């Protein structure tokens with residue numbers, strides 16, 4: 001069934017599993033035409049697929065050519081997502097394949113279920129948590145690879161870096177989800193927090209600043225601090 | 238005009254014959270139903286006065302044999318049996334007919350309701366849905382489950398309706414997932430009509446039989462099947478024109494006949510709103526949409 005705060009530990013047990021977020025698959029800019037009408041121009045997208053135990057993120061890049069000549073793109077995007085997830089699962093051996101796929105938006109349930117009919121033993125589940133995987137394109141190296149793609153492409157990066165050398169998956173998912181959640185509420189502030197210190201380097205090979213344990217505690221506090229404020233600034237509290 | 242003689246009426250019971258019904262008192266001198274129109278299937282059904290639980294009944298066709306109803310006190314129900322002595326049958330019927338111990342199938346001459354509800358229903362197909370091969374008639378009741386229901390528990394007492402499942406490999410061609418799920422024309426025309434039912438008359442016959450079992454017995458699995466067969470047509474972009482026009486007629490008379498007080502349980506809001514207002518065929522069912530809007534506007 002649905003995944004919520006009560007079964008918030010199942011994510012880190014030993015059933016190989018991935019989450020699927022489709023919020024960045026079909027992306028457009030809206031603009032005026034010469035005649036004064038409105039049109040859309042698609043830009044590259046990605047499906048944010050995340051192993052929340054290991055942090056592996058399969059950023060299947062959706063090149064704008066996939067929309068060419070198609071109608072009802074917002075509907076197609078959900079079926080394109082399900083097709084690509086199904087293809088991903090099929091490329092793996094059975095033992096390497098996951099046991100559950102959790103979709104972040106309920107509208108993905110039917111497309112994925114239909115694409116996964118060949119896999120009756122893989123549970124397709126919704127969730128009630130408000131998960132911040134739409135903010136994945138606020139991560140500079142992820143946005144860069146999506147925007148540079150000239151063809152369909154798979155960009156698989158472990159979003160936990162080497163964080164699992166020092167902390168548990170539960171904590172790693174908590175750090176990642178708070179980092180992502182902050183970026184969604186106020187991207188500029190969140191990014192300032194993360195880079196305000198020039199001596200801490202997002203190493204070339206990692207998506208996150210090489211913080212020490214103590215520095216991560218400060219960063220996390222600053223991010224929870226941002227989310228708090230924006231909540232007030234939004235509601236005036 | 239044929240006859241179903243009754244050996245007696247030892248327990249108080251409401252007896253239905255097709256869309257008609259009448260109350261028989263305990264040990265009343267009731268000995269059957271006469272003037273039954275030849276050419277159609279019929280259903281004779283029962284609701285005991287003391288136990289409104291379990292409506293039950295028998296589908297039959299008087300062209301296929303001489304049938305009588307005898308209360309069995311051990312099993313506690315009105316059974317239908319076949320008389321194999323044609324001389325006994327004529328003698329027993331004539332006897333009861335001369336003493337005026339039978340009710341007359343009370344059809345109005347203008348009234349084509351029963352024909353319209355059973356146009357495509359044949360006994361031979363009923364007997365494949367209700368498997369009891371030693372009888373020429375078929376027993377159904379409120380509690381019998383369908384083969385599809387049993388997959389999600391007595392197989393001999395099941396309704397063997399054709400399994401329809403929109404999220405199944407039968408319904409969805411590999412590589413056409415989105416196309417086949419959002420437009421079920423393949424599943425309707427190739428899998429069901431060409432492959433399984435062979436023609437639209439057999440499809441409509443099962444649809445009509447499912448509705449009648451839902452209406453007369455409150456059989457939940459039958460109601461599921463009726464709605465699934467409607468939804469499969471309405472969710473197909475490509476349906477033969479004669480099929481759409483015939484479905485409109487079929488549903489019109491089903492909706493006309495439904496008791497106004499049973500519409501809350503026999504009609505599925507989602508299916509009907511989808512079929513009438515959202516589906517490919519939302520503009521193809523003019524007669525059904527008009528009677529639904531004037532009779533059950535609350536549902537919509």
Ligand SMILES: COC(=O)CCn1ccc(=O)[nH]c1=O
Pocket residue numbers: 017018051054056096097098
């Ligand atoms: C479906 O696979 C996954 O969710 C991640 C599997 N995995 C584990 C360890 C590793 O080094 N690389 C990798 O790809």
Ligand SMILES: COC(=O)CCn1ccc(=O)[nH]c1=O
Pocket residue numbers: 129130131132173174175177178181224
């Ligand atoms: C204090 O941080 C946490 O408790 C992480 C959990 N979390 C965070 C952000 C979010 O959108 N969803 C979520 O489940």
Ligand SMILES: COC(=O)CCn1ccc(=O)[nH]c1=O
Pocket residue numbers: 242243244304305306320325326329
């Ligand atoms: C009046 O006698 C009986 O009713 C005997 C029982 N019975 C009833 C009807 C019939 O066709 N054959 C038969 O044997």
